[PDB]
Structure 1
Amino acid sequence: TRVFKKSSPNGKLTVYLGKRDFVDHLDKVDPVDGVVLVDPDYLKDRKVFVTLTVAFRYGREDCDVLGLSFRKDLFIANYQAFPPTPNPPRPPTRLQERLLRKLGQHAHPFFFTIPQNLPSSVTLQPGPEDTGKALGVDFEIRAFVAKSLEEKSHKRNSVRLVIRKVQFAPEKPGPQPSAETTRHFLMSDRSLHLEASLDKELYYHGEPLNVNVHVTNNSTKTVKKIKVSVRQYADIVLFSTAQYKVPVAQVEQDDQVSPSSTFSKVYTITPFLANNREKRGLALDGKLKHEDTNLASSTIVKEGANKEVLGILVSYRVKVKLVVSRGGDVSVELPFVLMHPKPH
């Protein structure tokens, strides 16, 4: 029943939004619908428009003394709020009708559709060495009044508000993730067998990862140490292909694997943000203004492979490293997903 609203600094132009967050069901997205409230006597000759834009923004917005974002406009949409447009698309919405009931004549609804080929709201962790905020893709709604679309923007006229787009976990479990690797010697037939498995393929933040690793060291070398870690992969694509990978959680056990022996164990690794408050380049979930959040939720690609290289893509993997004596170190990897469940 409650309804958010934002107003112009002059107090004359006000916009109402019923929701702050939107979700996608891998086939459709919740439409962005709202109503702008304004008395036409203030303008009496201008026209009101509301614009949807998504940009690759860097830095902060509080008049920092530094070169600001490389403002790449990934996608921009415009709608004519005033003068009134025809009925589509397609009808007015229920909440817009209720708000028009609440206000009356000066209520003007608008409709928008979000294309399916858009990235998710993510924000990179700013570094203490740097200043202000950091780079990150964000959504933004902008409403303004002017006689022309190309008229100069005014602080008193234009109003800026920030919205978010997030995904939620599907209810269908996937195949069981497992991996194996057998490495022999240079000449002798003796080999080194290792197998890694996980309880599930989809987990939840704060839930420990019970990795099941089995080592069949039917060889002559002795494994000195064992290292288990999870790696975060962040694909950066604006006009070139890039990927910045940073370790997030590492666990080491002082276990010796004797030659011609089989050793299997289950280890616990937990990703958390407390220990990485200073690590630059970390990817985090989209924030409102500056509020803290958890780690960046693993966004899942749609069924269509297409391109979808229009922003930041994130994925997680787990690697286990065996410290074999006199070289011969062998490591195995396993991809997995980790992102929020569906609320009610």
Structure 2
Amino acid sequence: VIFKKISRDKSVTIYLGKRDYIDHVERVEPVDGVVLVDPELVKGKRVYVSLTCAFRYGQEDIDVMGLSFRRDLYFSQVQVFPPVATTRLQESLIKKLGANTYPFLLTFPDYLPCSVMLQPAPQDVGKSCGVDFEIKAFATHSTDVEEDKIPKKSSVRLLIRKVQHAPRDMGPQPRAEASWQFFMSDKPLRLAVSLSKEIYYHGEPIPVTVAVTNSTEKTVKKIKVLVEQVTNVVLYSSDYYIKTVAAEEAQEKVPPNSSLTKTLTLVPLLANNRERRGIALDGKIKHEDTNLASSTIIKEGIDKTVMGILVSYQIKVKLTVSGLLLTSSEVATEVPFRLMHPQPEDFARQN
């Protein structure tokens, strides 16, 4: 399946192999495509293709001051026409389309975030924001460069996604486990939480093993296990969101001088969430192929602020503990894990 889009004036048509380009940490899948020009309508002009990654912040509200912010995180441009290595997709598209088809290759660097965006809920303090990736093909004249204008009718833009996949090689995953001792009157309530591994895939079930050892004279009335998505906007405005994307409540008691081990399975999915606002996604709410944002992966030496939006996941265990008799207390603890797409194997989107 090839994805095509044509300029208003039909002088420039762009063809891409895919909408979604894979980041698997080691390297990023480059954007290889072709531009089909109409020789009469290009005439004495030059056609370029650009790859822009930008962070954006702000939304249009009636009677609320317009506030907009944009920061380019990467820009790269190449000339396709007139022509100045190739790939199988290009060679095949050229033969399929004709002699007015010209190839382009734009590469991603290693310091960029992946597709993340966020539209807030009514109770949420800050505004709409996200990281977009735009492939734009456009024609310029030599009096167009002289006035600094690139006519819109001669241009065509595609909003591609950079998608986080797990790296191809990685050693056998350590279990993600922590333990806490909550002394209550100098008798310990011990809580251990353990996951099977550190990295889970979108759709993969997460087996959360909870081990309560109650040496206190109080009763654990209730055990609740959540997958929480933590979002930190780290450009323009320091917005913070924490949202439940999966929840199981065991509801089984742990009486005094007893211990209880239980494994609950959670699956953090956008489908579990009627309310799709306040949560970091990899695309727009309306689109069908939109998932929960993958865990941000900050490379060594890269300042976290250039990622724009930081997305992390954690298992939260809340224990309701009975009073003396009065009302009851609640302790809670977090175990971090990472959520991304599976390891890789060796244009308008559906609503």
Aligned partner of 2:195: which letter?
L
Q: Name whichever structure is richer in helix by fraction.
A: 2
Aligned partners of 2:244, 2:36: CA distance in 1, in Å?
49
Deviation string for 1:56-84 (max 9, x for gaps)? Answer: 346799xxx99585333232222233343
1:137 alignment partner, one of 131, 137, 140: 131
Contact 1:118/1:308 (8 A) holds in 2: no
Give 1:42's aligned amino acid.
L
Distance in 2 between the 1:78 and 1:318 partners? 42
The match for 1:95 among 89, 94, 111 is: 89
1:261 & 1:213 partners in 2: Cα distance? 14
- The 5-angstrom pairing of residues 322-337 of structure 1 reads 322-326=319-323, 329-337=330-338
The code of the aligned residue for 1:119 comes to P
Q: What is the Cα deviation at residue 316 of structure 1?
A: 0.7
Structure 1 residues 237, 42: CA separation in 2 closer, same or farther (over 3 Å shift)?
Answer: same
> How far has the Cα of 1:287 moved from its partner?
5.0
- Please list every run of 5 or more consecutive structure 2 residues that lacks an aligned counterpart in the other structure: 346-351
Per-residue deviation at 1:140?
0.8
* Equivalent residue runs for 1:30-179 within 5 Å: 30-57=29-56, 67=66, 70-85=69-84, 91-103=85-97, 105-125=99-119, 127=121, 134-147=128-141, 148-149=144-145, 151-170=148-167, 172=170, 173-179=172-178
Counterpart of 2:255 in structure 1: which amino acid? S
Contact 1:125–1:284 (CA<8 Å) still a contact in 2? no
Distance in 1, Cα, partners of 2:213 & 2:96 = 72
* Residue 142 of structure 1: how far off its partner (Å): 1.1
| C-alpha contact (below 8 Å) 2:58/2:69 kept by paired residues | no
Q: CA deviation at 1:129?
A: 9.6
What amino acid sits opposite 1:282 in the alignment? I
8 Å CA contact 2:270, 2:276 repeated in 1: no
Contact 1:50 / 1:144 at 8 angstroms: preserved in 2? yes
Residue equivalent to 1:290: 287
Give 1:284 shift.
1.6
**Counterpart contact for 1:81–1:109, Cα < 8 Å:** yes
Aligned equivalents of 1:296 and 1:27: distance in 2? 19
Q: Is the 8 A contact 2:69 2:236 kept in 1?
A: no
Structure 1 residue 138 displacement after superposition? 1.4
SS at match of 1:41: helix
Shift in Å at residue 328 of structure 1?
A: 5.8
Aligned residue type for 1:117: Y
Q: Is the 8 A contact 2:276 2:285 kept in 1?
A: no
Asked if the contact 1:236–1:313 (Cα under 8 Å) also holds between the matched residues in 2, the reply is yes
TM-score scaled to structure 2, two decimals?
0.80
C-alpha separation between the residues in 2 aligned to 1:230 and 1:38? 50
Q: CA deviation at 1:118?
A: 0.6
Give 1:23 shift: 1.3
Q: Deviations over 1:238-288 (max 9, x none)?
A: 246543222222333433322222222222333333442225311122259
Q: Secondary structure at the match of 2:312?
A: strand
User: 1:45 and 1:235, CA in 2 relative to 1: closer, same or farther beyond 3 A?
Assistant: same
Distance (whole Å) between structure 1 residues aligned to residue 330 and residue 101 of structure 2: 69
Residues 27 and 228 (structure 1), Cα distance of their counterparts in 2 relative to 1, 3 Å cut: closer
What is the alpha-carbon distance in structure 2 between the residues aligned to residue 288 and residue 3 of structure 1? Answer: 24
Between 1:238-247 and 1:310-319, the stretch displaced more is 238-247
CA distance in 1, matches of 2:281, 2:336: 19
Superposed CA offset, 1:201-257 (max 9, x none): 333434443321111111223333322222111232224654322222233343332
The residue that corresponds to 2:348 in the other structure is none
Judged with a 3 Å threshold, the aligned counterparts in structure 2 of structure 1 residues 135 and 292 are, in CA distance, closer, same or farther, namely farther
- Quick check: 1:339 aligned with 2:340? yes
Q: CA deviation at 1:318?
A: 0.7
C-alpha distance in structure 1 between counterparts of 2:271 and 2:24, whole Å = 31
CA distance in 2, matches of 1:328, 1:127: 30
